[PDB]
Amino acid sequence: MITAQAVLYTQHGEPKDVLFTQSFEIDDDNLAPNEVIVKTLGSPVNPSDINQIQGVYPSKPAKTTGFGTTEPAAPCGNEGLFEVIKVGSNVSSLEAGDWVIPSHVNFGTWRTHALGNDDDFIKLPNPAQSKANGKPNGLTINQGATISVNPLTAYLMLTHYVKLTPGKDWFIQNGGTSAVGKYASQIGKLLNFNSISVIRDRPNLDEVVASLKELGATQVITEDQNNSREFGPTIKEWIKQSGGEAKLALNCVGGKSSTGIARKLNNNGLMLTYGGMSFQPVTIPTSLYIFKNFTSAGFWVTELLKNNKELKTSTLNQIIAWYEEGKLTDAKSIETLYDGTKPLHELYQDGVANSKDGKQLITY
Amino acid sequence: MITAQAVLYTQHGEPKDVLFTQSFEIDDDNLAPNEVIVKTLGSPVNPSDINQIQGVYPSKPAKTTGFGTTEPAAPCGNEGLFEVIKVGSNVSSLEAGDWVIPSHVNFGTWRTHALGNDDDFIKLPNPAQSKANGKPNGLTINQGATISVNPLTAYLMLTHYVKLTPGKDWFIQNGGTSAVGKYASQIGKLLNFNSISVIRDRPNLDEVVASLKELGATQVITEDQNNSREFGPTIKEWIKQSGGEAKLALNCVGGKSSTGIARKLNNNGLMLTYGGMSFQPVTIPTSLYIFKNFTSAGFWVTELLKNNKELKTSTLNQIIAWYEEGKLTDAKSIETLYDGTKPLHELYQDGVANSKDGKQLITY
């Protein structure tokens, strides 16, 4: 018998108000033939996990009395890395010690353990296996725990919609310091796409600029430069002088920022909106649509991959391979370790409240 | 010799400030083998004509001294109907008496006559020719003079981007009382497409609503209803009962109106922005792109048909056919006849100033 903790809520609302920790037992001596028990190694706090709890995200786990609560309650978190503890008698896809991530969204990853079917998980090579397979590197906890959402988002947005000619074409993105932005920059470098990252100004601008260029951004500008009429021609020269064109814009901010990157694209440009950190709508001048044949669309990784395991697998394997080859690094996280001295849900409420400091990862 | 008049400007500005009339001569006796002389029957004042003169429209006539001015001057007007008066010794495509429209934009239609090559024009059937073919109707001056821009814009937006299932699917459009909106309603009913027209409220609402439904709108709502969450379910019920889906939105207003019509589309919807009469940008909530997979694109008939004679020809023929059969009616115009007593340019300046009254057509 295993005693586990799960972060739940009986009703939607702000994480700071509705989350709680529910103690529950998992019978490791009576697993159905296809069941598996996993122990969480780490799971992050992503904006979508929060919106899901708030009730403003159209994809969520059902509320049930399954964890032993009197009222129906839903679990939290959609991605994370777990270590397999035990498999049922008919399980062959997984075994003790394996590293896995949920095979689908809405599994609930903010907890110490989980009981599920073998098909509820996807196996990632763990360090022991990467070494035995002769790979140069093995995944870290954070890399495994954040491999499902942000890296695939960056990869698919950059390759699934418009073909950028290697060594010539460009994509421009705001939210340059975001985890997704950092993954996009690297993938751009790996695929040989040029790129402009737009970020908010800061006292350590120079340091962040060099850091993002190391990751792979060709040029880094501030939102003030993004808004500047006078600076505009300098950006256009970068594109024109490269021989390619700015064909794609990645927007996760909205507002003025989204207007600014759209204006930087060449005619027939495409913008993918995948986030709205400013809480401002996407505003595009009528002229961009008519005279520059601009197109504005959306991206939702959860929806793109829910019934396309093939595209998901192919994308995931590429990220894993780059991690094993030492060609990709992770958007780093501020890790908070659960040790039982502080209720689990509080560690997540803190991670939520401290999101502004950067990606939060609760570890176990 | 023929003494002609042309409305010109030597510098971009407001029509009321920079326009003037230039008298020039055409030698109807010295025609090159492939030249043609035509006299204008009528030409409209369209928003794009004005934007062109203002210098905020990226497609324009080269300034030249061809009309006998010392400083380079540009002509005005992009569409219109002309009657062929004389053709060169090598012209077989046109005969005296034929009706033609410019074959390309930027020809300058705000003038009494024009000398050009045969390939500078596209023949339309004149009344006698339509009649000799047993067609119920011949084209009127206004129908011929306004056939190049608004009707083709409406047709191509409804048929060239997303396929609406006849008898089922819907398109929604703002700017319902505009000439384009009136063509879209008619083309919509002729192709058996369902549609909702959005217009600004007015005291004679009932009459305008009835009028738009006769033209082809299935339903007509005000912008207030467009802004209404309360009203939302009513629209959704209309679509549900039809068994179809709202797949396309036509936007020529911008601002809140563009937001409102975008929201009423079913998931995977497409909006075509082709105008922005409110002078407000297209604003779309982040959630529509991500969760509803909405797409916002542009439309510019000038750019689309620029190097696509076949698509232009085909679309033009379908409009001519509907006029000849009597199935399509023109967005009516307020006509001002030039008789040589008031400078030609003033007639057009009045046309520009009285735009809000409705489509203006200067006749000859």
Ligand SMILES: NC(=O)C1=CN([C@@H]2O[C@H](COP(=O)(O)OP(=O)(O)OC[C@H]3O[C@@H](n4cnc5c(N)ncnc54)[C@H](OP(=O)(O)O)[C@@H]3O)[C@@H](O)[C@H]2O)C=CC1
């Ligand atoms: N649609 C999809 O499939 C996916 C969408 N997303 C979206 O991406 C965003 C989260 O990304 P990750 O999860 O990569 O994010 P992180 O939490 O790592 O980064 C968030 C970023 O947003 C920036 N930011 C915060 N507030 C503002 C503001 N007011 N104006 C401009 N920028 C601001 C931060 O700036 P700074 O560095 O200056 O502090 C930081 O760069 C969310 O919008 C999330 O919902 C993520 C994955 C997938």
Ligand SMILES: NC(=O)C1=CN([C@@H]2O[C@H](COP(=O)(O)OP(=O)(O)OC[C@H]3O[C@@H](n4cnc5c(N)ncnc54)[C@H](OP(=O)(O)O)[C@@H]3O)[C@@H](O)[C@H]2O)C=CC1
């Ligand atoms: N290829 C392209 O991209 C093309 C673009 N256009 C664009 O379409 C529009 C012109 O259309 P046509 O040439 O059909 O126009 P008209 O001038 O004939 O009609 C314009 C109509 O728009 C309405 N209108 C004016 N201001 C507003 C507002 N703020 N909100 C809602 N309605 C408003 C009027 O309403 P009411 O009568 O009720 O007062 C009027 O019925 C312009 O935006 C023009 O540039 C046209 C052809 C092609």
